[PDB]
Amino acid sequence: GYDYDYLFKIVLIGDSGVGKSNLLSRFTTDEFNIESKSTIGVEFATRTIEVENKKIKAQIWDTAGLERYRAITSAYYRGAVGALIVYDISKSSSYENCNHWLTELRENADDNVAVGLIGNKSDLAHLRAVPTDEAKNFAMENQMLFTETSALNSDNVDKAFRELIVAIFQMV
Ligand SMILES: Nc1nc2c(ncn2[C@@H]2O[C@H](COP(=O)(O)OP(=O)(O)O)[C@@H](O)[C@H]2O)c(=O)[nH]1
Ligand SMILES: [Mg+2]
């Protein structure tokens, strides 16, 4: 990793418990943590991927519990060129709160940010509370990419991040 052509900062946002921290770990180091306690703070991790023979350092940010800390929250969004809004396919509240997250993006992130919607925990299909076609339509109406993922079993995680990175690449 001596060099890279671009660095794309991407923020993960969404309700607590949906799997953001595990999406970060699954994508960056192929790791998953079954632990149900949220870490209060901010972190980032990187992975380099290739798009059209260009090396892109994807710098993936994750946070919890700092919403009342203004400067840190500002720093969280600062410079982000992509965002993934994450809900839990088994928890309708997390999906219904996606409009809040879109609004947070509009109010805190740069105008040009490329956005993907992720319905995580697809392995909990027996507990599904959000129909795929409904969420897919909501994503389209709001100019968001859409993927259902399982951070737990890995399903579609690389796809969700890659598609967004390709989309960021086309814009810039
Ligand atoms: N079944 C299932 N559990 C998951 C998945 N992703 C995360 N979890 C679990 O859901 C809980 C919340 O995950 P976490 O990544 O901390 O969510 P966050 O609060 O959005 O950062 C933890 O117990 C995780 O192990 C998934 O895809 N499937
Ligand atoms: Mg977390």
UniProtKB/Swiss-Prot annotation:
A molecular-function term among this protein's GO annotations: GTPase activity
Domain of life: Eukaryota
The keyword Nucleotide-binding appears for this protein: yes
Keywords (A to Z) from UniProt: Acetylation, Autophagy, Exocytosis, Golgi apparatus, GTP-binding, Lipoprotein, Membrane, Nucleotide-binding, Prenylation, Protein transport, Transport
Segments carrying motif Effector region: 36-44
Any one of the GO CC terms: recycling endosome
Subcellular location: Golgi apparatus membrane
Outcome recorded upon mutating S21N: Binds preferentially GDP
GO biological process: autophagy; early endosome to Golgi transport; exocytosis; protein transport; vesicle-mediated transport
Residues that bind GTP: 14-21, 62-66, 120-123
Membrane topology: Lipid-anchor
Ways its activity is controlled: Alternates between an inactive form bound to GDP and an active form bound to GTP. Activated by the guanine nucleotide-exchange factor (GEF) TRAPP complex, and inactivated by GTPase-activating protein (GAP) GYP3.
Entry function: Required for protein transport through the secretory pathway. Probably involved in regulation of secretory vesicle formation at the trans-Golgi compartment. Mediates the proper polarized localization of SEC2, a GEF for SEC4, but does not alter the exchange activity of SEC2 on SEC4. Plays a role in autophagy.
Family membership: Belongs to the small GTPase superfamily. Rab family.
Subunit structure: Interacts with YIF1, YIP3, YIP4 and YIP5. Interacts with the GEF SEC2. Interacts with TRS130.
Additional note from the record: Present with 4298 molecules/cell in log phase SD medium.
Protein name: GTP-binding protein YPT32/YPT11
Species classification: Eukaryota, Fungi, Dikarya, Ascomycota, Saccharomycotina
Covered range of the whole protein: 7 to 178 of 222
